[PDB]
Amino acid sequence: MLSTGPIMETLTLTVGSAFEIPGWKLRGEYPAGTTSHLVFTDAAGGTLGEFEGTVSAKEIHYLQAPDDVKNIPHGANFQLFVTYPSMQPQCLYFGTAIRKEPRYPLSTVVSPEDSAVQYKANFVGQYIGPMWKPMGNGWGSLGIHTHALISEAPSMGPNYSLFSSAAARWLWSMNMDSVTIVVRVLNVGAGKFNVIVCADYQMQTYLGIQFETGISNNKVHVITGDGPLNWGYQGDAVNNTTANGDVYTIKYNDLLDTISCYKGTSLTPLIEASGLDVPHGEGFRYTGLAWNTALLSPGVEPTAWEAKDGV
Amino acid sequence: TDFLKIELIGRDGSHWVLSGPGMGQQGVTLNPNLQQFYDAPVKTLYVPGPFGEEYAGKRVQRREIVFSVQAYDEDPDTWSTVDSLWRWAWDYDEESELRVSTSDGTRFLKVRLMEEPKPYYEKDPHITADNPIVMTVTATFPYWQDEPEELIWTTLSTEDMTRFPVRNDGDVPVWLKWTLTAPGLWILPDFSWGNDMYSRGREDLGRTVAMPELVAGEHVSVDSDPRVQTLIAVNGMPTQNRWKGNDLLYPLMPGKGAEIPVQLKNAPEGGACKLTRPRWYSRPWSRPGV
Amino acid sequence: TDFLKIELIGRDGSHWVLSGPGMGQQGVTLNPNLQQFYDAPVKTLYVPGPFGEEYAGKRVQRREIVFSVQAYDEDPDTWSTVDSLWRWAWDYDEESELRVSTSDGTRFLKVRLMEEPKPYYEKDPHITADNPIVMTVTATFPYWQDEPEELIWTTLSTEDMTRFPVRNDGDVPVWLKWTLTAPGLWILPDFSWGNDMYSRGREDLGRTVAMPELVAGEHVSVDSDPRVQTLIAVNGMPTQNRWKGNDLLYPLMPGKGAEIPVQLKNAPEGGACKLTRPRWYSRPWSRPGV
Amino acid sequence: ANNWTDILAASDGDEWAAFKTIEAQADEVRAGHQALRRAKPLIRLWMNNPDGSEGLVYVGRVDYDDTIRGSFPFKNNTPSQGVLELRDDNYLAVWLKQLPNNPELKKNVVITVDFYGGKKRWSGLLDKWTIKSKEHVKYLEVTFNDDLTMLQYLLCPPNPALPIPVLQFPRIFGIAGPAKWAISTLIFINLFRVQGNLWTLPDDPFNLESWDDILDWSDWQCFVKSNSFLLDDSSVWTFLSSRMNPVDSIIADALDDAQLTITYRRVLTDDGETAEGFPGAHGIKNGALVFEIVDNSNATALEGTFFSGTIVDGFARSVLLYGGGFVEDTLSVVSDDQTLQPDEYYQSGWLATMAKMPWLVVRDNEWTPIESSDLSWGPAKNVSVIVGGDN
Amino acid sequence: QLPNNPELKKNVVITVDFYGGKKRWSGLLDKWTIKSKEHVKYLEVTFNDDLTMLQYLLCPPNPALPIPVLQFPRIFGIAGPAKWAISTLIFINLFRVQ
Amino acid sequence: HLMALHDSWIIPGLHIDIGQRMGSTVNSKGVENIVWVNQLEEMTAAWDNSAGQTMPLSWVLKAGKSDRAMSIGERVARLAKKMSEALNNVGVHIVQS
Amino acid sequence: HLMALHDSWIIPGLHIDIGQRMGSTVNSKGVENIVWVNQLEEMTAAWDNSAGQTMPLSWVLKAGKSDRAMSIGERVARLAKKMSEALNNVGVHIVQS
Amino acid sequence: SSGGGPAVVNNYGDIHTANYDEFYKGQQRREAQQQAPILPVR
Amino acid sequence: SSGGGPAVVNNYGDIHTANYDEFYKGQQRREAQQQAPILPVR
Amino acid sequence: SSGGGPAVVNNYGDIHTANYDEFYKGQQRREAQQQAPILPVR
C-alpha cells in the first residue's frame, strides 16, 4: 500500500432532517486556504449534488438544508475531497449514501390496477387475433371481411359462414368506470352494430350504443345488456345515416353516470342517456362489440377500434 | 415475558398458560427449545436447468412441533391430578388450540398429538412431583390464524347488488367462503387479483361466476378452498351437477383487496349472503406489511 | 472491514448493510461462517478410460448459501419490528439482491429462500432482543454479476454496417443480447472465439447468422443465453418460427474480444441496434483477467 | 406498428429510453410465455346423463394441488392410459367410489384435463379405480383410457350399410381413395352403422350438400370431420380392407405409411366451444368426440419438408421421389429452397408449428434447458419383402 | 457419424477374437444408443450374431424358379442325411437369393 | 379385492372355500357401509422360516376376478395361452388343398 | 446347469465348445458322486471396466436346456416366436373363397 | 452444517431410508400404464 | 437404548444392509410362480 | 482401521450409497439382451 488512498465509508440521509457531518469526524491539520467539497453522483456518474465543507484549523464541518439533500437517492455514491492550498484535490472518503428514514414503497410504485389503459385494433392483418374473445355463439363466430371491391380496409364481423349474429369481448378489462371508445366503421349493408361498455365478465349486463342501418331504419339507440346477444332499447332513437369510414366516439362518464355518442368531430352528443340501471365498478369494466344481421352479409362493421380509460 | 403469551385450549376446553404473564398457574409451564413453531415449513421445488437447477415452485409442509412442558406441584397427589388434566387436554383425532398473544394480536394454531407423549424422568414421577412431558404435536394446517372476518348482506328486493369490502393483510393467500340463501340466482366474484396460476391474471381481474339457479330450500355453501367441495347444498341436492364445468379458482392474494361485487337476481323473497374471509399468517407474530 | 461491504436489497426494496462500513445500522448484522458464497459450485464429469477416468466436461451447480444474521435492538418491541422487517425482506417466489462491494466494484447475486428461516434461541426472543436467524437461501443463477455493458448503433441508411467492441473481462463465458428494430434484415455475429464445443472452433471463427426479415413494427430481442428463447418480437409475432432452425450457438469466451460486425439491409427507414454484454463472475471479487 | 422513429419521438429522442421501452415489451411477452407454460392444468370429471339422454353432465373439478400424482401421455395414433391419484377424502374420489353402488348414476365417467386454457386437452373414459394402502393410508388410483380407444371398439363389417346377421357381401370391405378421406370415410361409415344406419348413405359422406338439413345428429357421441373425395388434398391414395377388423387395426398401416395423425377433440359446449366441418356439427351435444385425420408431418407434400439439418445452417428441405412402381421413395434435396412462410407466422400470438415450415430445433450442449435421455439409431434390416399366400 | 455420412454404407460388422482368433464372435450392428449417466454420455452398441441371417433367409416352395410366377408344389420338402439336408436347404436358399 | 388374514378368526378352507361367495368391506370414505360380495377366487398359504426374514403360515385371499387389475405379466401369459389354443384350433380346422 | 468359470483352468472355446458334451458336479448331499453330462449350450464372455464395479473378462457356461427352468420372459419370447411363425404358416395355407 | 450430514445424504440419494417394494411397484405401474392400452381384449 | 439406534433402524426397514439382487430374484420367482402354470407348452 | 468401518461396509455390499434406478435399468438391459434376438420381427 505505497500510495495513500480513500477510506470506504457510508453516509446517512433522512427526509426532513438536515444533513450534517460533525467536525470531530474529519480531524487533521488543515492550513489556511484548505477547501473541502463533497460530491454526490448516480450510477451513470452524473453529478446529482455538490457541497462545500467548513474547513477549520483542525476540523471540517458539513451542514446542508434538507431540501439540498432531498434529491439524493439511496445508493447514490459520494466522494469527499480535501484540497490543501496550491495542491490538487485529495479524496479522503468515498462510498454510498444510505437513507435511514421511514420507507414509502407505495409512493414510488404504481399498481397495475392503478394505471390507465389504452387499446387499439386494426383488423388489417385479416386475422382475429388473441385479444378478442368470441361470445354469444362461441368459438369461431368472428371473422374478417376484406371489402376489396371498394377502397376500404378489412373489417371485423360475425362468421357469416355459420352465424348472422356474434359478440366479441376485449380480452383485458379497463381500470376506470369512465371509458372512451373510438370506432371507425363501414356501412356495407343492413344490420345492427353494438359498441358495448361497462360489461361484466360474460357480457351479461352492459351499456351500449347501437348503430342500426337498413332500408329505412338508419338510427342510433342506447341499449342495456340482457346477454351477449340480447339487449333492451333505452330512451328514444336518434336518426343517423352511417357512411363508410365514419368515426363515432362513445364516452361513458362515471361521475355523470352518462353514456353519450358523438359523430365525427361534433362537440355535441349525437345521442345521450343517463341514469341506467346497470352495475358499475370493479368487475364491470369489460368492453366489446356485437353484430346482428338478418342476411348472411356484413352490415355495419368496425374497421378501426380504439379504447381508453377515462373521459 | 410480558411481550409474548402462550396459551393452550384443550380438546375438552381447558385453559392453560404455558408462557407469559400468568404462566404456571395451572401447574404446567413451557420448557425451552421448541422447534418448527415460528415459521411455516415450506419446501421449494427445483428442476434441472442450464446453469444448475431452476426454481419450479414451493410446497408448504404441515407443522411438526416438538416441544416440552413441565408439570409441577408441591404434593404428588395434586401433581398427578395436574398431569392427568394435561394429558386430557390433548387427543389424536380432534385438535386443540395453541394461541400466541403479542403486540401484533392473538394468533392460534390447531394442533393434535402426532405420537404418544413422553412423560417423566427415569424414576417414578411421584418422587419429584415436578416432571417434564415431551409433546410431539402436528399442525395439519400449518398457518397461524386469527378469527375470520364475517360479513352479512340481507336484501328483500328481487334483484339487488352489494360491494363486500375484502382485504388480505396476511402474508399468504386465503380462500373465501360464501353462504347463500335460496331461491335466487347468485353471481359471485372470482377476481384473479393478478394471480397468474391459470395464465389469465389480467383476463380474470374482474371475473364473476354465476351459480346455478337455486330452488326453494337449496341453501348453498360455496367454499373456494381446495380442501372442500365448492358447492354444497344443505338438502343434499347435487347443485354442482347443474353448473357446467365452472369453478372458483382464485384465492385472495396477499396485500390485495377491493369492494367485490355480489349480485342477486330472481329472488322472490330476497336473500342473504355471508362472506367469511380467513386471516392466515405464517408466523405467530409479525408487523403488518403492504 | 472497510475492504468489503455486503448489502441485502429485499423483495420489498428495503436496504440492509450486513457487513462493512455502516453495518448493523438497520439492526441486522452478518454472523461468521457463510458457505457456498465465494466460488460458484461446479461438478466435473469423468468417463471410464484406459488409464482410469477421462475428463468429460463441467457443469455449474446452483448456490445453496447457508448464513446467519443477528437482529438486535435495545428494546424488545423495536427488535420485533426489526425481525419482522427482515422477514419481509425475503421470499420464496421472488428473489432479493445480495450485493458485495470491494475495490473490484460491486457485484450482486439474486437469492431466494430455499426453505423456512430458523429464528431465535431456545428461549423466547424478547428476553434478549438480540437473536440469530439462520437463512438457507439459494441462487438459481450461481454467477455473481455486474451491470452489463450496453452499446447502441442507430442509422438512417437503407443498408449499413457497424462494429461493436466486445471483451469478456470475467472468468466465465457470457451470452450476448441484441435489440433490433424493424423493418429490416439483420446479419448478427455468432463468433466461436475459438471455442471447440461443437468441434468447429476455427471453422466458426467468423460465423454470421441472418435473422428473418422483420416486418414493420416487429422489433425483436435476440437473447443468446439458453435460459430464454432466442427471438422474441415485441408485437407477439412468431419471429423464430420463420427462422428455419437457426440459432446463436456461441457465448463470448473469457479473455476474448473483437469488433463484432452487425449488418443491416432492406431497411427503408433505417433501423437501430443495441448490444448488451453481461458481466458474469464466479466470485464476489476478483482482479480483471486478461 | 410502432416504428423506431415513433418510439424515439415518444421517448423524446433518448435512444436508451426507447430501447428500454422495447426491452420492457419483450420482457412482458416472455413473461406471458412463461405464465402460459407454468399454468396449472384444469382437471374436470363429467358423467353421462342419469336419465339416459345425450350430453355429458358436469360432475366436478379436481384441484392440481389436491391431486397426489398424475400422468397423462399423448401418443401418435396409439391409445394411452392416464393415471390420477387422489386422497380418499377428496370429494371426487368419494363420488367415484360410490359410483359402482349408486343405482341413480350411469357407470361411465369422462376426464378432461386442460392445459393452456383448453388449448391442449386430454380426455378419456374411466378404465378403473383402485383403493391402495400405503402404510395404512388409503388413496384412490384412477385409470382412464384416452379417447383413441373408441377406434378399437369400432369395427368394420364387410357391408356396413346392411344388417350384419343377414348378408354381409362381399367377403371383405375395401375402400380406396385419398388417404385422409378414405380413413375418415371408413370411420364415418362405421359410426353411421353403429348409430343405427337410420338414413341413406350418399355417395360422398363429406360432401355436405348431400346431407339433408332436417337430419338430427345430436344423439351421435362421435363424429368425423374431413374434406370431400374431390376436395381432399392428400397426395397419396390408400386401400383399406376389413373383415370385421377393428378400425384402428385397419388404418394403422395407412397412417404409418402416409405419416398421418388422428386428432380427437371432445367438444365441451358447456365451455362455449363449437365445431364445424362435419354433418350435424351445429347440434352436437356437450362432450361429444370429434375425429380428424391431419398431415402434421407434410412428408408426402409436393413442396416436401425438412428431413435433416445442421445447427449452423438450420433445416434442409427435401422432397420425396418415387422409383419404379412407387414402392420405393428416396429424398431429393431442394437446392434452391424458395417456399414462402405460412401466413400464420405473421400473426400476433401464434405459437404453433405449421406442417409446411417446421421451425423447432431443440439443442443440447453444456448449458441446455432440457435433458436428453437417449438417442438411438439403427440401420434398415431386410432388403426384400415377400407378401402373398393364395391368389 | 455413420447414420449421417452419405459416403458410407450403413452396415457394420464386429469381430471379437478370443485366443488369437481361435474363438470368434462376429455380428452385424443392430443399433446404438447415446446414454447419459449423471450428465456423462457414452455409446452402447448392440450387435446381432451372424446366426440371425438364417432368420432372414427363407425357403420358398420352389427355390429354383421365380417366385411371383409359379411356386410348385405347395410346400418344398427335402429328405436326406441330417447334416447334408440342412446344409442343402441353406445352400439352395443362398443360391436363390444370390 | 385382495385381503391378507394375519391373525383374523377367519379360517380359509374351513369357513370359506374356493368359489364360495363372501362379502368384504374397505374403510374408505363413501363406501364404509357397502359390502362387496364376490366369490372367493384365490387363497395362498405362505410361510418363510429364514432367520433373516420370518413369516409364519399366513393366508392371502383374492375375492372376485378382474382382467383390468390383473398384472401385465399374467395378462400376457393368459393371452398367450388363449392365442396358442386358438392357433391349434385354426390349424386343425384348415382344409387341405 | 449354470456354471461361472472365474479363474478355473477351463478355457471356453478351446477346451470345450458349444454343442459339445461335458460333465459337471454339484456339491450337494446325495449327488456328490453323480456327474450330470450335458452338451454345452451357452457360454457368455462379459467384462466391465467401470470404476464403481470392475469385473474382468469372465465366462459363464450353461450346459443343457430346460423349458421348465427358463425365465418367464424368455419363455414368453420363444412362445411368441413360435406362434408368429405358425400364424404365418396357417395364413399362407389358407384356401381362398 | 448442511454440508457433511443428512443434508448431503439427500444429495447422495437413496443411501439411507429407501424401500425396494415401493420402487418395484412403481416401476410395474409405469410399465402397466405403458403396455395396458395396447394389450388385446381376448 | 433400543429406541434411537439399530433397533429403530429395523423399524425403518431396508435402510441399512439389504441387497437388490435377492429382492429382484424373489420378485421374479413370485411372478414365475404366478404365470408359469398358465403358460402354454408349445 | 479398515476392519470395522467403510472398508467392511464394502464387504457388507450396497448398504450405503446404491440406487435402484441403474440396477433396474441393468436388469432390463440384461433381459433385453436375452430376449430381443428371439422376438419376431412382426
Side-chain angles (χ1 to χ4, degrees), chain A residues 43-247:
Chain A
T47 290
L48 55 90
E50 188 176 0
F51 312 113
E52 284 80 16
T54 311
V55 185
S56 87
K58 292 175 317 166
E59 290 181 327
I60 311 165
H61 182 78
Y62 279 85
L63 188 40
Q64 306 288 327
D67 303 331
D68 297 347
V69 291
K70 72 179 296 281
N71 46 358
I72 302 169
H74 65 279
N77 55 7
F78 77 96
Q79 213 167 0
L80 196 145
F81 294 88
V82 160
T83 307
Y84 295 93
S86 69
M87 287 207 213
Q88 301 290 76
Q90 161 181 0
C91 168
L92 289 188
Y93 300 101
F94 78 104
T96 300
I98 199 163
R99 289 198 153 274
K100 189 187 282 187
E101 69 204 8
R103 199 170 63 87
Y104 313 127
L106 300 196
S107 71
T108 62
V109 65
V110 164
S111 192
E113 53 89 20
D114 202 77
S115 66
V117 294
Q118 179 158 357
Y119 309 123
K120 320 194 74 167
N122 210 357
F123 317 130
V124 74
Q126 278 99 8
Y127 62 90
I128 292 299
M131 287 310 297
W132 291 105
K133 175 170 140 190
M135 304 215 90
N137 291 346
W139 298 358
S141 58
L142 302 160
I144 303 281
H145 317 91
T146 316
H147 311 302
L149 203 46
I150 44 178
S151 182
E152 275 305 322
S155 79
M156 178 189 177
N159 196 5
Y160 288 122
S161 316
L162 319 174
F163 317 95
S164 50
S165 66
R169 195 275 304 275
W170 185 254
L171 206 61
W172 300 332
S173 169
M174 305 282 151
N175 287 110
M176 293 179 80
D177 297 342
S178 43
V179 56
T180 305
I181 311 283
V182 174
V183 294
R184 173 187 186 285
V185 300
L186 266 51
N187 174 45
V188 178
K192 298 173 299 222
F193 169 60
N194 311 312
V195 175
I196 284 163
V197 307
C198 286
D200 58 310
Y201 190 79
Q202 303 280 326
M203 264 204 190
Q204 291 303 312
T205 69
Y206 47 78
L207 298 180
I209 300 298
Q210 164 159 3
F211 318 97
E212 174 169 5
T213 59
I215 181 65
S216 190
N217 51 81
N218 302 303
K219 53 194 182 290
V220 166
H221 307 268
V222 170
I223 69 170
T224 43
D226 201 8
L229 302 174
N230 298 334
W231 50 84
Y233 296 130
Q234 312 277 147
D236 286 331
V238 173
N239 299 342
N240 187 55
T241 301
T242 305
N244 295 22
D246 272 6
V247 175

Side-chain angles (χ1 to χ4, degrees), chain B residues 169-171 286-289, chain C residues 11-12 83-90:
Chain B
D169 66 313
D171 47 353
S286 75
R287 302 283 181 233
Chain C
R11 57 159 292 273
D12 49 1
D83 183 75
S84 298
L85 293 188
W86 178 256
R87 181 53 197 88
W88 277 113
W90 290 96

Side-chain angles (χ1 to χ4, degrees), chain A residues 7-8 10 98 100 103, chain C residues 2 5 12-13 15 25-26:
Chain A
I7 303 299
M8 198 207 287
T10 176
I98 199 163
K100 189 187 282 187
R103 199 170 63 87
Chain C
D2 46 351
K5 194 180 179 117
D12 49 1
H15 200 110
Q25 290 303 314
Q26 305 88 32

Side-chain angles (χ1 to χ4, degrees), chain C residues 82-100:
Chain C
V82 161
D83 183 75
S84 298
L85 293 188
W86 178 256
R87 181 53 197 88
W88 277 113
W90 290 96
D91 197 21
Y92 313 94
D93 283 311
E94 47 201 357
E95 281 162 331
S96 44
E97 209 169 277
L98 182 72
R99 292 178 81 82
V100 161

Side-chain angles (χ1 to χ4, degrees), chain D residues 181-381:
Chain D
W181 178 88
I183 297 175
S184 314
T185 300
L186 184 68
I187 305 173
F188 178 87
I189 298 305
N190 294 142
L191 289 190
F192 206 75
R193 175 196 52 94
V194 71
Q195 295 291 339
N197 268 323
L198 304 172
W199 293 272
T200 75
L201 271 171
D203 265 359
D204 197 358
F206 302 108
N207 179 24
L208 279 72
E209 303 297 328
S210 52
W211 289 111
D212 194 7
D213 303 347
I214 318 298
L215 301 178
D216 188 22
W217 312 69
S218 61
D219 48 348
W220 284 41
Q221 62 163 351
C222 288
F223 299 91
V224 178
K225 58 168 309 171
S226 161
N227 302 345
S228 84
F229 185 88
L230 308 175
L231 277 296
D232 212 46
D233 44 356
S234 306
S235 43
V236 302
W237 270 39
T238 189
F239 172 78
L240 313 167
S241 49
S242 162
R243 185 161 172 79
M244 292 280 175
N245 282 116
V247 160
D248 61 328
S249 74
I250 299 152
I251 65 190
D253 48 7
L255 288 159
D256 194 8
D257 205 10
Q259 309 203 23
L260 300 176
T261 315
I262 308 193
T263 60
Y264 69 94
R265 179 100 180 159
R266 211 161 260 275
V267 185
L268 292 180
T269 81
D270 286 353
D271 277 32
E273 321 174 19
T274 62
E276 52 92 24
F278 47 103
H282 57 81
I284 74 167
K285 297 290 182 51
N286 187 75
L289 193 63
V290 191
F291 285 114
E292 192 181 7
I293 316 297
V294 296
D295 192 14
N296 274 340
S297 79
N298 212 54
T300 50
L302 193 77
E303 74 277 353
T305 174
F306 300 141
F307 289 88
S308 48
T310 59
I311 74 179
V312 300
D313 64 350
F315 293 121
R317 173 96 54 175
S318 316
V319 55
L320 282 173
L321 176 62
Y322 294 98
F326 300 86
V327 194
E328 302 174 357
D329 48 347
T330 176
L331 298 170
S332 75
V333 294
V334 180
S335 291
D336 199 20
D337 190 25
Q338 297 306 315
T339 52
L340 276 81
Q341 307 275 11
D343 295 349
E344 290 85 15
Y345 285 1
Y346 289 108
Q347 304 170 0
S348 173
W350 188 268
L351 295 167
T353 288
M354 290 318 271
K356 76 182 292 214
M357 196 75 56
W359 69 279
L360 189 48
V361 55
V362 181
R363 314 191 303 104
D364 172 31
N365 44 306
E366 177 172 354
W367 315 267
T368 177
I370 69 166
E371 73 93 22
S372 58
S373 179
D374 50 343
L375 189 141
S376 75
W377 172 84
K381 311 275 255 183

